Amino acid sequence: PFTIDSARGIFPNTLAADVVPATIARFSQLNAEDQLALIWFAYLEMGKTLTIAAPGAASMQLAENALKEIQAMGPLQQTQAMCDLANRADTPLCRTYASWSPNIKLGFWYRLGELMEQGFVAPIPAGYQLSANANAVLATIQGLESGQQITVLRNAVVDMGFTAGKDGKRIAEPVVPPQDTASRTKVSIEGVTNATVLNYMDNLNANDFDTLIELFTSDGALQPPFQRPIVGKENVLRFFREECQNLKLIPERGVTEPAEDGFTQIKVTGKVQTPWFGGNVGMNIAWRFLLNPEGKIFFVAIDLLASPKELLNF
Ligand SMILES: CC1=C(/C=C/C(C)=C/C=C/C(C)=C/C=C/C=C(C)/C=C/C=C(C)/C=C/C2=C(C)C(=O)CCC2(C)C)C(C)(C)CCC1=O
Numbered sequence: 001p002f003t004i005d006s007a008r009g010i011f012p013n014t015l016a017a018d019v020v021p022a023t024i025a026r027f028s029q030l031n032a033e034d035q036l037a038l039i040w041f042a043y044l045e046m047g048k049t050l051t052i053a054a055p056g057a058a059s060m061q062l063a064e065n066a067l068k069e070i071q072a073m074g075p076l077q078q079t080q081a082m083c084d085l086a087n088r089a090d091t092p093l094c095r096t097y098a099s100w101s102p103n104i105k106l107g108f109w110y111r112l113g114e115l116m117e118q119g120f121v122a123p124i125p126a127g128y129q130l131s132a133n134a135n136a137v138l139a140t141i142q143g144l145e146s147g148q149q150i151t152v153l154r155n156a157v158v159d160m161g162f163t164a165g166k167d168g169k170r171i172a173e174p175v176v177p178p179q180d181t182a183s184r185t186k187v188s189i190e191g192v193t194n195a196t197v198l199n200y201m202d203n204l205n206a207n208d209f210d211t212l213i214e215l216f217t218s219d220g221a222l223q224p225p226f227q228r229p230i231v232g233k234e235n236v237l238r239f240f241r242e243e244c245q246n247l248k249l250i251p252e253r254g255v256t257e258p259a260e261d262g263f264t265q266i267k268v269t270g271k272v273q274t275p276w277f278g279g280n281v282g283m284n285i286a287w288r289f290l291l292n293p294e295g296k297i298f299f300v301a302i303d304l305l306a307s308p309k310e311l312l313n314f
């Protein structure tokens with residue numbers, strides 16, 4: 001209850017799926033052309049059983065100029081551009097890409113994937129064989145749960161491009177209006193009646209970010225899977241609006257314990273669906289909340305769990 005960074009240690013029994021950042025770190029080592037081929041291979045294979053939702057209209061408009069620029073290039077330059085992104089080279093295209101929210105980056109690649117499939121953008125060379133390191137990276141990915149697989153792909157997409165500057169322009173999709181109060185569902189969590197936790201889940205499921213942020217302490221933080229804590233209301237609200245639209249949180253069960261100085265720690269496990277996959281992928285998630293004496297959120301971590309055996313009382 002003293003520092004955000006120390007709160008990261010609550011519920012240390014929770015086995016997170018650290019194969020995901022392990023696998024990203026291996027992937028990130030690879031030659032850029034192998035990075036692109038590996039993801040193309042993983043995307044095609046995944047596409048046999050799992051269809052990516054179409055990118056939204058707003059997102060596509062925001063990426064349109066950059067997409068058109070690539071499509072207008074000669075094939076060799078197309079491949080160079082894609083390699084630039086994967087290598088995190090400093091180019092205008094890479095800087096533009098880095099200004100984008102994850103969803104806009106994902107929609108940019110969705111479009112390129114389609115164009116590569118159709119042959120209008122330079123495809124991976126015919127009969128391309130992955131490097132030794134890359135083949136093993138792909139094998140690891142394909143052995144993971146689908147929730148882990150899609151998190152690897154997202155993290156690979158988000159990592160591309162080049163950031164120059166701390167206060168650079170941030171482009172995101174427009175913010176959706178909150179769900180009308182009448183049509184809102186309420187979660188039920190075995191063992192957990194805590195109104196802060198329940199309001200957290202319900203407000204996020206309604207896209208009600210302005211209500212959600214009011215649950216947090218001024219200095220409070222939210223820690224997304226495999227990322228550092230996002231600290232303070234401005235940054236946490238920004239993150240909700242840019243990256244947390246249209247989720248479906250399906251918490252199942254939890255456990256509630258005292259913490260130092262009148263705090264309460266609560267762990268919840270359940271599933272989450274992203275709008276990119278809907279009900280076809282349920283990620284196994286834990287939430288770990290540290291609530292202050294008045295019930296506001298000082299810290300919440302969201303963990304992708306190593307396996308379903310990590311869900312409480314499987
Ligand atoms: C790149 C590339 C390609 C294309 C690749 C493509 C098109 C790839 C597309 C990949 C896609 C669309 C991946 C989407 C992943 C989304 C996830 C993991 C969302 C998780 C959300 C969670 C857990 C949120 C949970 C949360 C909860 C519960 C909270 O309580 C608080 C909020 C928080 C957010 C933390 C080609 C195929 C063209 C080949 C070349 C190439 O390189």
Ligand SMILES: [Cl-]
Pocket residue numbers: 243274275276
């Ligand atoms: Cl998402």
